[PDB]
Design an enzyme around this catalytic site. Structure first.
Site, PDB file in Angstrom:
ATOM      1  N   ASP A   1      -8.740  -5.468  -5.023  1.00  0.00           N
ATOM      2  CA  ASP A   1      -7.706  -5.010  -4.094  1.00  0.00           C
ATOM      3  C   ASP A   1      -6.381  -4.806  -4.846  1.00  0.00           C
ATOM      4  O   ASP A   1      -6.005  -5.632  -5.688  1.00  0.00           O
ATOM      5  CB  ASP A   1      -7.526  -6.035  -2.964  1.00  0.00           C
ATOM      6  CG  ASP A   1      -6.977  -5.400  -1.699  1.00  0.00           C
ATOM      7  OD1 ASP A   1      -6.840  -4.169  -1.704  1.00  0.00           O
ATOM      8  OD2 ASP A   1      -6.689  -6.113  -0.717  1.00  0.00           O
TER       9      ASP A   1
ATOM     10  N   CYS B   1     -11.851   1.242   2.390  1.00  0.00           N
ATOM     11  CA  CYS B   1     -11.656   0.069   1.535  1.00  0.00           C
ATOM     12  C   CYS B   1     -11.221  -0.933   2.600  1.00  0.00           C
ATOM     13  O   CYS B   1     -11.857  -0.955   3.646  1.00  0.00           O
ATOM     14  CB  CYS B   1     -10.596   0.326   0.438  1.00  0.00           C
ATOM     15  SG  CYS B   1      -9.127   1.271   0.872  1.00  0.00           S
TER      16      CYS B   1
ATOM     17  N   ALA C   1      -7.765  -1.388   3.971  1.00  0.00           N
ATOM     18  CA  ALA C   1      -6.805  -0.669   4.821  1.00  0.00           C
ATOM     19  C   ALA C   1      -7.146   0.837   4.888  1.00  0.00           C
ATOM     20  O   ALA C   1      -6.644   1.559   5.736  1.00  0.00           O
ATOM     21  CB  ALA C   1      -5.412  -0.816   4.267  1.00  0.00           C
ATOM     22  N   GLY C   2      -7.958   1.310   3.961  1.00  0.00           N
ATOM     23  CA  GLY C   2      -8.304   2.723   3.953  1.00  0.00           C
ATOM     24  C   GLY C   2      -7.217   3.590   3.331  1.00  0.00           C
ATOM     25  O   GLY C   2      -7.092   4.763   3.664  1.00  0.00           O
TER      26      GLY C   2
ATOM     27  N   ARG D   1      -7.408   1.988  -2.440  1.00  0.00           N
ATOM     28  CA  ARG D   1      -8.588   2.335  -3.201  1.00  0.00           C
ATOM     29  C   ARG D   1      -9.162   3.651  -2.673  1.00  0.00           C
ATOM     30  O   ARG D   1      -9.537   4.530  -3.442  1.00  0.00           O
ATOM     31  CB  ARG D   1      -9.588   1.172  -3.107  1.00  0.00           C
ATOM     32  CG  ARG D   1      -9.139  -0.030  -3.957  1.00  0.00           C
ATOM     33  CD  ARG D   1      -9.977  -1.302  -3.716  1.00  0.00           C
ATOM     34  NE  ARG D   1      -9.616  -2.002  -2.473  1.00  0.00           N
ATOM     35  CZ  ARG D   1     -10.179  -3.149  -2.085  1.00  0.00           C
ATOM     36  NH1 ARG D   1     -11.120  -3.706  -2.845  1.00  0.00           N
ATOM     37  NH2 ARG D   1      -9.804  -3.742  -0.952  1.00  0.00           N
ATOM     38  N   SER D   2      -9.188   3.793  -1.352  1.00  0.00           N
ATOM     39  CA  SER D   2      -9.680   5.015  -0.725  1.00  0.00           C
ATOM     40  C   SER D   2      -8.862   6.227  -1.176  1.00  0.00           C
ATOM     41  O   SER D   2      -9.425   7.289  -1.439  1.00  0.00           O
ATOM     42  CB  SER D   2      -9.598   4.897   0.809  1.00  0.00           C
ATOM     43  OG  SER D   2     -10.563   3.964   1.279  1.00  0.00           O
TER      44      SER D   2
ATOM     45  N   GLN E   1      -1.747   2.847  -3.476  1.00  0.00           N
ATOM     46  CA  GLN E   1      -0.870   1.725  -3.174  1.00  0.00           C
ATOM     47  C   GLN E   1      -0.070   1.076  -4.288  1.00  0.00           C
ATOM     48  O   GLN E   1       0.771   0.245  -3.994  1.00  0.00           O
ATOM     49  CB  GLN E   1      -1.678   0.653  -2.442  1.00  0.00           C
ATOM     50  CG  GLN E   1      -1.894   1.016  -0.963  1.00  0.00           C
ATOM     51  CD  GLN E   1      -0.634   0.780  -0.159  1.00  0.00           C
ATOM     52  OE1 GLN E   1      -0.270  -0.371   0.096  1.00  0.00           O
ATOM     53  NE2 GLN E   1       0.055   1.857   0.224  1.00  0.00           N
TER      54      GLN E   1
HETATM   55  O1  LIG Z   1      -5.737  -1.193  -3.263  1.00  0.00           O
HETATM   56  C1  LIG Z   1      -5.753  -1.322  -2.059  1.00  0.00           C
HETATM   57  C2  LIG Z   1      -4.688  -1.972  -1.252  1.00  0.00           C
HETATM   58  C3  LIG Z   1      -5.299  -2.478   0.011  1.00  0.00           C
HETATM   59  C4  LIG Z   1      -4.380  -2.734   1.195  1.00  0.00           C
HETATM   60  C5  LIG Z   1      -3.209  -1.882   1.418  1.00  0.00           C
HETATM   61  C6  LIG Z   1      -2.326  -2.147   2.544  1.00  0.00           C
HETATM   62  C7  LIG Z   1      -2.613  -3.267   3.454  1.00  0.00           C
HETATM   63  C8  LIG Z   1      -1.701  -3.540   4.624  1.00  0.00           C
HETATM   64  C9  LIG Z   1      -1.112  -4.954   4.608  1.00  0.00           C
HETATM   65  N1  LIG Z   1      -0.405  -5.154   5.887  1.00  0.00           N
HETATM   66  S1  LIG Z   1       0.075  -6.786   6.256  1.00  0.00           S
HETATM   67  O2  LIG Z   1      -0.124  -7.147   7.905  1.00  0.00           O
HETATM   68  O3  LIG Z   1      -0.626  -7.867   5.132  1.00  0.00           O
HETATM   69  C10 LIG Z   1       1.783  -6.806   5.725  1.00  0.00           C
HETATM   70  C11 LIG Z   1       2.188  -7.497   4.493  1.00  0.00           C
HETATM   71  C12 LIG Z   1       3.588  -7.471   4.064  1.00  0.00           C
HETATM   72  C13 LIG Z   1       4.584  -6.756   4.867  1.00  0.00           C
HETATM   73  C14 LIG Z   1       4.176  -6.067   6.104  1.00  0.00           C
HETATM   74  C15 LIG Z   1       5.149  -5.360   6.927  1.00  0.00           C
HETATM   75  F1  LIG Z   1       5.679  -4.261   6.107  1.00  0.00           F
HETATM   76  F2  LIG Z   1       6.230  -6.272   7.350  1.00  0.00           F
HETATM   77  F3  LIG Z   1       4.708  -4.799   8.247  1.00  0.00           F
HETATM   78  C16 LIG Z   1       2.777  -6.094   6.529  1.00  0.00           C
HETATM   79  C17 LIG Z   1      -0.135  -5.073   3.434  1.00  0.00           C
HETATM   80  N2  LIG Z   1      -0.212  -5.810   2.235  1.00  0.00           N
HETATM   81  C18 LIG Z   1       0.958  -5.407   1.554  1.00  0.00           C
HETATM   82  C19 LIG Z   1       1.293  -5.938   0.171  1.00  0.00           C
HETATM   83  C20 LIG Z   1       2.138  -4.985  -0.664  1.00  0.00           C
HETATM   84  C21 LIG Z   1       3.487  -5.383  -1.091  1.00  0.00           C
HETATM   85  C22 LIG Z   1       4.291  -4.476  -1.917  1.00  0.00           C
HETATM   86  C23 LIG Z   1       3.748  -3.169  -2.317  1.00  0.00           C
HETATM   87  C24 LIG Z   1       2.400  -2.769  -1.889  1.00  0.00           C
HETATM   88  C25 LIG Z   1       1.595  -3.672  -1.064  1.00  0.00           C
HETATM   89  C26 LIG Z   1       1.754  -4.452   2.304  1.00  0.00           C
HETATM   90  N3  LIG Z   1       1.022  -4.272   3.495  1.00  0.00           N
HETATM   91  C27 LIG Z   1      -3.782  -4.113   3.232  1.00  0.00           C
HETATM   92  C28 LIG Z   1      -4.665  -3.851   2.109  1.00  0.00           C
HETATM   93  S2  LIG Z   1      -6.508  -1.210   0.372  1.00  0.00           S
HETATM   94  O4  LIG Z   1      -7.737  -1.909   1.199  1.00  0.00           O
HETATM   95  O5  LIG Z   1      -5.808  -0.005   1.208  1.00  0.00           O
HETATM   96  N4  LIG Z   1      -6.800  -0.885  -1.347  1.00  0.00           N
END
Ligand SMILES: O=C1C[C@@H](c2ccc(C[C@H](NS(=O)(=O)c3cccc(C(F)(F)F)c3)c3nc(Cc4ccccc4)c[nH]3)cc2)S(=O)(=O)N1
Ligand SMILES: [Mg+2]
Length: 298
Positions: free
Chosen positions: A180, A214, A216-217, A220-221, A261
């Protein structure tokens, strides 16, 4: 020219700046349906939603929402459906989408559990003798066979519409070692996998759009679709050096937010396309080289 650009980005150490510029320039479209209170439990992550204009609509009258987007690349002539890893309550929806959109292949780039955390529901059967029934959508799914390699597995699934009894063979391409927010082990291992999907016929326009996901789609997607699309364009244009990967990614981001991402996934995308170009340009040894390098028979 693509590797010249790559080479100067590396020399300048500007991958993060380039990637952040793409994030800043990316399209912003409404996601009103995804954000309705009744759809809260249909979204895995609150900040990853499909835009209303490109979302996939389920054919049911009750609630047609699914966190999935149609990425239609006009010039490359290929469409992909990018969706999040299904939730326990949206596996029926996932297969209803696959059925309705007539997809032939499903590309999974994550594992169900990654580093102690669930990232996706077990939406397909792991055992032949334990088929799955999704009652809400009237579909039956059976594992027919699987070919397990060291870093990826290809499975033959039989999806049946219980109402009409029509059955379809669905191919499942599961990349099991792509971390991830990370990248594949090498361009070779990524390309070996991509070409396995291409060779299966699953990406043919005679079928509906391949479904790629993946967790979140988007990360990786997005990497997988960007490389595939860029290689398609290189094979299509009179001058493969004209392919602007940053422009192609901005185009993809008009259909779904956040594709790619991290800055390193962007850099990896360049490497994958630069490496894959050898095959597009003729080289008939690279493919076997990719397989060898991928150590798939480990
Ligand atoms: O390589 C990848 C990344 C995964 C991935 C990408 C996004 C998310 C959504 C999460 N929402 S949350 O409900 O876990 C989440 C987490 C933090 C803030 C947040 C708000 F912005 F406040 F809504 C939501 C998520 N994780 C981050 C970490 C991150 C930090 C800085 C730069 C890039 C990514 C940001 N959003 C989950 C998995 S994938 O499966 O798309 N493949
Ligand atoms: Mg068994």
């Amino acid at each position: 020219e693509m590797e010249k650009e790559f080479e100067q980005i590396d020399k300048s150490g500007s991958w993060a700046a380039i990637y952040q510029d793409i994030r800043h320039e990316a399209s912003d479209f409404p996601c009103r349906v995804a954000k309705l209170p009744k759809n809260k439990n249909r979204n895995r992550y609150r900040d990853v939603s499909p835009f209303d204009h490109s979302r996939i609509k389920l054919h049911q009258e009750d609630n047609d929402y699914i966190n999935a987007s149609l990425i239609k690349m006009e010039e490359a002539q290929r469409s992909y459906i990018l969706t999040q890893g299904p939730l326990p309550n949206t596996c029926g929806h996932f297969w209803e989408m696959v059925w309705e959109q007539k997809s032939r292949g499903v590309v999974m780039l994550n594992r169900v559990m990654e580093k102690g955390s669930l990232k996706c529901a077990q939406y397909w059967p792991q055992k032949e003798e334990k088929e799955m029934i999704f009652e809400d959508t009237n579909l039956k799914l059976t594992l027919i066979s699987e070919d397990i390699k060291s870093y990826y597995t290809v499975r033959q699934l039989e999806l049946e519409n219980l109402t009409t009894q029509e059955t379809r063979e669905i191919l499942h391409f599961h990349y099991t070692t792509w971390p991830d927010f990370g990248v594949p082990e090498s361009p070779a291992s990524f390309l070996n996998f991509l070409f396995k999907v291409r060779e299966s016929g699953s990406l043919s326009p005679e079928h509906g759009p391949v479904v790629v996901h993946c967790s979140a789609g988007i990360g990786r997607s997005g990497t997988f679709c960007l490389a595939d699309t860029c290689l398609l364009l290189m094979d299509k244009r009179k001058d493969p050096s004209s392919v602007d990967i940053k422009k192609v990614l901005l185009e993809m981001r008009k259909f779904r937010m956040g594709l790619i991402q991290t800055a390193d996934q962007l850099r990896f995308s360049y490497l994958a396309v630069i490496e894959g170009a050898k095959f597009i340009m003729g080289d008939s040894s690279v493919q076997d080289q990719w397989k060898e390098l991928s150590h798939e028979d480990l």
